[PDB]
Amino acid sequence: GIVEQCCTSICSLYQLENYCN
Amino acid sequence: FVNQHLCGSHLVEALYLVCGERGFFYTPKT
Structure with a gap:
């Protein structure tokens, strides 16, 4: 899931945008 | 923006x- 990407590596602001609309 | 691994709070x-x-x-996942 997207949470893993941000926990184990570095979510850029572009990846972070997915958590909202 | 500052790079950091991001988990939890x-x-x-x-x-x-x-x-x-x-x-x-x-x-979340209990």
């Missing part, structure tokens, strides 16, 4: 900034 506080006034949600 760090992820939540980062999302406030990126999503701004739109708000956001999180998917």
